[PDB]
Amino acid sequence: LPGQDYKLPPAQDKISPLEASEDDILRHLSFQEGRLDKQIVDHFSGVSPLFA
């Protein structure tokens, strides 16, 4: 609304995918049964399913 304070888009609860770590990237996806692309989607910030 005009005049209202900004609230800022919600946090997706991920980690920064770039300049993260060669180890941080895997210590949190936790692949068990094969939802790999969806795990990349909902565990990384701002990534499309096409990139996964």
Add this chain to the structure above:
RNA sequence: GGUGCUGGAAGGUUAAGAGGAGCGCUUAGCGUAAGCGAAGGUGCGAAUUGAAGCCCCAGUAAACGGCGGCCGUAAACGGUC
């Protein structure tokens, strides 16, 4: 903003009173005719001065008083008179 109250004349409007230009009426006399006419007297009095007040300028609402309409958008914001 308008009206009241208070303050301010830069500029116009200003009455009575001062002021007297000038213009009529009479005639001692100039005049063949019709008119002109000095000094007085008697009416109209133009310019120039002549305050408050009014137009004006500011403040004052626990002074008088007033605090709107249409169209959208989700009280609030946007467009217009």
